[PDB]
Amino acid sequence: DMYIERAGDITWEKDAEVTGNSPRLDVALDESGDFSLVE
Amino acid sequence: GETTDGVYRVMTRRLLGSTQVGVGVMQEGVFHTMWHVTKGAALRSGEGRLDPYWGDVKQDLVSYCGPWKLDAAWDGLSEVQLLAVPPGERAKNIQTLPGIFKTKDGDIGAVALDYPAGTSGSPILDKCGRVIGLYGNGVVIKNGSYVSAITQGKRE
Numbered sequence: 387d388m389y390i391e392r393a394g395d396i397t398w399e400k401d402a403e404v405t406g407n408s409p410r411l412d413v414a415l416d417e418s419g420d421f422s423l424v425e
Numbered sequence: 426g427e428t429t430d431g432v433y434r435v436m437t438r439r440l441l442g443s444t445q446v447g448v449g450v451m452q453e454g455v456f457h458t459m460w461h462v463t464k465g466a467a468l469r470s471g472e473g474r475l476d477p478y479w480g481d482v483k484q485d486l487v488s489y490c491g492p493w494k495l496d497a498a499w500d501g502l503s504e505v506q507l508l509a510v511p512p513g514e515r516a517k518n519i520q521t522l523p524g525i526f527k528t529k530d531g532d533i534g535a536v537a538l539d540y541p542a543g544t545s546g547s548p549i550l551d552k553c554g555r556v557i558g559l560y561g562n563g564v565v566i567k568n569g570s571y572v573s574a575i576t577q578g579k580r581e
């Protein structure tokens with residue numbers, strides 16, 4: 387059985403930690419909603 | 426139950442203790458999450474029940490109590506924030522520049538941030554705090570890290 391609990395407000399935070407790269411990837415999306423890499 | 430706007434954890438007591446299976450967004454009285462989090466099952470909010478209203482396995486999205494309300498889109502240029510809600514950890518904003526998933530039906534923004542699977546459904550925001558999509562459906566790259574699409578629904 388599933389339940390929900392509040393975790394916070396949805397706001398943009400100034401001076402948040404900035405991380406992660408920006409990759410450009412060729413992908414395919416199947417009928418089951420699964421993404422896969424096309425090479 | 427609680428219907429105030431905000432980000433929420435999706436929990437289950439079926440497994441050992443209380444386990445976080447995902448995250449969602451409450452906006453305009455409608456709860457938005459990813460299909461793989463609930464599999465379309467009903468939800469509890471205190472003593473109140475939330476029934477599914479719309480869902481689609483291919484989009485990997487589901488809304489409760491009403492139709493999908495989130496319609497903001499990534500502009501294709503600017504940095505965004507993942508409002509990550511990891512299991513047993515405080516909500517934390519992480520800023521990043523999205524990459525792109527190129528598909529036969531068009532390009533989609535993508536966020537290269539790695540979090541536990543129970544973080545699926547955390548919202549991605551623009552500079553005005555508008556939800557431009559949810560985190561949690563993507564691919565495993567050569568490195569072993571996850572790259573999630575910026576998955577957004579359609580406001581009918």
Ligand SMILES: COc1cncc(-c2ccccc2C(=O)Nc2cnn(C)c2)c1
Pocket residue numbers: 461539540541542543544545560561562563565571
């Ligand atoms: C446990 O190791 C993992 C392996 N693969 C993916 C993840 C993961 C990481 C971050 C956010 C979401 C996920 C995730 O599981 N996504 C998903 C999409 N559809 N389904 C059915 C599951 C984790």
